[PDB]
């Protein structure tokens, strides 16, 4: 009943605004076929990922969850071509599509693509530079923890997003037994009592059915 | 049952994340004992604004429909010393009402309030710097003129947005008779149309129940 109704919504704003991408279509064929979870952003949400991007000037972003690649794609072709994005993926069989559609999309000189636990990863940055724009949506589990490490190689104005924090409803339930409500929550309460930074959440509706988001600016110290 | 769940979530996630605001608070009492239409953005949207407030590094904003300020106030507490927002109020009661929110939320000196019809002002404003940021919400009829208006007075990196644009459902009619509704589908298809415009859109639920909102960056 409702969904029909955000669907319908949501392919009249997509149709009359967002232009056809023949690659952006290819990059979705080939997730479907490599069979994997259809977790991809709508194409409204995809775009947003890019606004934000030139809103922060990014420079340097990085992506916790490659999946296929499709917000990857959405971002990187923002990026100058002296920028560059970190994106992390744990699942062989993903990093293996995720790697042909980033060069797919011409994107894969920007884009590095780090195949492993993402909080290896994230341990063997050093020294790195901070980040301008930190796209979250991996392992709920183990949001508290990237939103740490998202903290660790954040400056100020640096923007953090962190995707699917509603999980229909249940992120409300305070004694869930789901341990991807549990992490949402503890990285939602840590977010909230974290000072440097200056939050708030969006829910949303649409083709992707009922969701939303995190966003959170980095102050500075 | 749905509004319920969104409510509940939108309870939680604001009680988590943003700080209480007794100053907020009044503002919004204020606006319920005036008797204005209940349309103020729920606190989320309006941490929301004041976030593209920093991420533009906005010096000058331009709001479309102040009614009672508290979308004013959420970004205007966000500018810098240099800071103006130009707000545009047509009904003399809500533009009263908004005065002295302004005044008691301590940012009327950060804002200009100009009373009367917002087309009119538009016409008024003659060779003004452009704005950083342009927010809509107003009269959804004119949305089509605010639009091309919003595009004068832009810089590449510009942000418009434009709220309430679902008008529960109805924005997808080819054939209704409403001119807000009709009034939004110009203003999408227009801003759709403009190469000079890269836009999205998204809906969403909350206390506020089931809308959506539009943004634009303006490029060079």
Same mark, same amino acid.
């Given at each position: 009943?409702?969904?029909?109704?955000?669907?319908?919504?949501?392919?009249?704003? @997509?149709?009359?605004?967002?232009?056809?991408?023949?690659?952006?279509?290819?990059? #979705?064929?080939?997730?479907?076929?490599?069979?994997?979870?259809?977790?991809?952003?709508?194409?409204?949400?995809?775009?947003?990922?890019?606004?934000?991007?030139?809103?922060?000037?990014?420079?340097?972003?990085?992506?916790?969850?490659?999946?296929?690649?499709?917000?990857?794609?959405?971002?990187?072709?923002?990026?100058?071509?002296?920028?560059?994005?970190?994106?992390?993926?744990?699942?062989?069989?993903?990093?293996?599509?995720?790697?042909?559609?980033?060069?797919?999309?011409?994107?894969?000189?920007?884009?590095?693509?780090?195949?492993?636990?993402?909080?290896?990863?994230?341990?063997?940055?050093?020294?790195?530079?901070?980040?301008?724009?930190?796209?979250?949506?991996?392992?709920?589990?183990?949001?508290?923890?990237?939103?740490?490490?998202?903290?660790?190689?954040?400056?100020?104005?640096? #923007? @953090? @997003?962190?995707?699917?924090?509603?999980?229909?409803?249940?992120?409300?339930?305070?004694?869930?037994?789901?341990?991807?409500?549990?992490?949402?929550?503890?990285?939602?309460?840590?977010?909230?009592?974290?000072?440097? #930074?200056?939050?708030?959440? #969006?829910?949303?509706?649409?083709?992707?059915?009922?969701?939303?988001?995190?966003?959170?600016?980095?102050?500075?110290?």
């Amino acid at each position: 009943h409702m969904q029909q109704q955000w669907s319908a919504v949501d392919n009249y704003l @997509i149709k009359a605004l967002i232009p056809g991408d023949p690659v952006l279509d290819r990059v #979705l064929e080939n997730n479907h076929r490599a069979g994997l979870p259809a977790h991809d952003v709508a194409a409204n949400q995809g775009q947003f990922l890019a606004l934000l991007v030139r809103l922060t000037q990014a420079k340097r972003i990085l992506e916790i969850g490659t999946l296929g690649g499709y917000s990857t794609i959405w971002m990187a072709r923002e990026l100058p071509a002296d920028g560059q994005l970190l994106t992390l993926e744990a699942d062989a069989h993903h990093a293996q599509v995720a790697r042909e559609n980033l060069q797919l999309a011409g994107v894969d000189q920007r884009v590095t693509l780090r195949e492993g636990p993402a909080l290896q990863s994230l341990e063997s940055l050093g020294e790195c530079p901070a980040f301008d724009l930190i796209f979250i949506d991996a392992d709920k589990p183990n949001n508290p923890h990237y939103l740490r490490w998202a903290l660790r190689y954040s400056r100020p104005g640096t #923007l @953090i @997003i962190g995707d699917n924090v509603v999980r229909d409803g249940e992120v409300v339930n305070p004694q869930s037994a789901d341990e991807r409500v549990q992490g949402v929550r503890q990285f939602i309460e840590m977010m909230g009592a974290e000072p440097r #930074l200056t939050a708030t959440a #969006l829910q949303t509706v649409g083709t992707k059915g009922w969701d939303g988001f995190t966003l959170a600016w980095v102050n500075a110290a």
